[PDB]
């Protein structure tokens, strides 16, 4: 399916190449570059590009284009998810998915590509197998390697590969047995210029860090099962129990992974913790406009809102801006016309606010609409939907491991008009 892979530096350079079926000429990337030239931006590059021969499928992320070469028809998502998975793998092995990380670990990188894809069709997949086939590079490991030889490749098949539980490593051993569940909710919302909520929905994910030895069976129970509607389950989950009991029993893979992905029932309304008061004006051919925004606790759940970043995408008419924050730090970007305001947190007794005037381009026309604002924010110990976990019950192992659970609500895209 996938004949070759090119990593393209966003500056326009063939950073790295890998071939599985035949040597694909580098000239094929001319079409990619053409598309890049005809693209509005790096995020507006069409995932699928047809060329005279071969189809290109690509993923933009981490300021890097993963470009694959396809010979014959293959379901686009098959390729996309696989390719995306590869990028995630690089982050797992090197801690960061970047060209610099690769430049230092080229050999390992190249080997990983060889293990993951077999002549165009996926072979090594899940990290709990791949980590055993090729040991990840560490400082201490390289020290060992300088003595015994650079051996990071296993000489046997990971036992789990041939088991009925392939996502878990066999022979796992810890003395400090523990498990963590991080329930993170996502507030994705569209706010009207009046402050009214146009659209809002809570999505969520339960991440897990498992450090339990042997073959443990974890089981989660929730405080309000009814909040869970469209729920994606990690392959390890025996959905039949979920279906009949609504209980998450499963043999966990170790390491870090996402367990549950879900949508909160639309029957209940989404609490919006942040309101935005925003007075802004522009004038036809004026050298000056106005700006006054206040960020505060709407349905803040009685909690402190923190990790706040306020980003306004301004119209070309703006040249500069005489604007002063009541909280954190504020900088205007005249190159891309962006108001970056680092709020940090909202004090119950004192609100973050930007107050001042806008330096506009005299002779330039008034913006057809006032610029929108994206806001990042979060609350510790908060599961804003109300979804809490009722009980964790481990079977199969002798341990009384740490059973930790954390609730954090984190904003997704939060766009407010004007």
């Amino acid at each position: 399916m996938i004949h070759s892979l090119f990593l393209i530096n966003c500056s326009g350079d063939i950073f790295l190449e890998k071939h599985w079926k035949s040597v694909v000429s580098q000239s094929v990337c001319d079409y990619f570059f053409e598309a890049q030239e005809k693209a509005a931006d790096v995020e507006n590059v069409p995932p699928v590009i047809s060329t005279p021969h071969h189809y290109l499928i690509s993923i933009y992320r981490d300021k890097l284009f993963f470009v694959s070469v396809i010979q014959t028809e293959v379901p686009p998502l098959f390729v996309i998810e696989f390719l995306h998975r590869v990028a995630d793998t690089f982050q797992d092995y090197f801690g960061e998915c970047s060209e610099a990380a690769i430049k230092d670990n080229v050999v390992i990188v190249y080997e990983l590509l060889e293990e993951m894809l077999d002549n165009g069709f996926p072979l090594a997949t899940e990290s709990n197998i791949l980590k055993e086939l090729i040991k990840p590079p560490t400082i201490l490991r390289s020290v060992v390697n300088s003595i015994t030889g650079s051996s990071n490749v296993g000489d046997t098949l990971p036992t789990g590969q041939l088991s009925n539980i392939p996502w878990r490593r066999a022979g796992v051993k810890y003395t400090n047995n523990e498990a963590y569940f991080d329930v993170v909710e996502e507030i994705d919302a569209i706010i009207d210029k009046s402050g009214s909520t146009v659209f809002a929905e809570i999505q969520g994910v339960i991440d897990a860090c498992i450090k339990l030895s042997g073959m443990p069976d974890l089981s989660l129970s929730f405080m309000n099962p009814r909040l869970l509607d469209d729920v994606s389950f990690h392959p390890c989950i025996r959905f039949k129990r979920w279906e009949s009991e609504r209980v998450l029993s499963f043999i966990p893979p170790d390491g870090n992974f996402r367990l549950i992905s879900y949508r909160v029932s639309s029957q209940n309304l989404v609490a919006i913790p942040v309101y935005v008061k925003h007075s802004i004006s522009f004038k036809e051919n004026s050298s000056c406009g106005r700006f006054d925004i206040t960020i505060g606790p709407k349905q803040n759940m009685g909690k402190t809102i923190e990790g706040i970043t306020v980003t306004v995408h301004m119209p070309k008419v703006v040249l500069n801006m005489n604007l002063t924050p009541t909280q954190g730090s504020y900088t205007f970007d005249p190159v891309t016309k962006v108001l970056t305001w680092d709020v940090g947190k909202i004090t119950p007794q004192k609100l973050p606010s930007l107050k001042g005037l806008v330096n506009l381009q005299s002779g330039a026309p008034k913006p057809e609409e006032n610029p929108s604002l994206n806001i990042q924010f979060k609350i510790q110990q908060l599961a804003i939907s109300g979804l809490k976990v009722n009980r964790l019950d481990m079977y199969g192992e002798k341990y009384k491991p740490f059973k930790g659970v954390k609730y954090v609500t984190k904003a997704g895209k939060f766009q407010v008009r004007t």
């Binding site: 523990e178 963590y180 510790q380 976990v389 009980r391 964790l392 740490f402 059973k403 930790g404 659970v405 954390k406 609730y407």
Partner: peptide, 8 residues
């Protein structure tokens, strides 16, 4: 690392 998590 356990700090910040609730026991369950």
């Amino acid at each position: 690392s356990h700090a910040g998590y609730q026991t369950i």
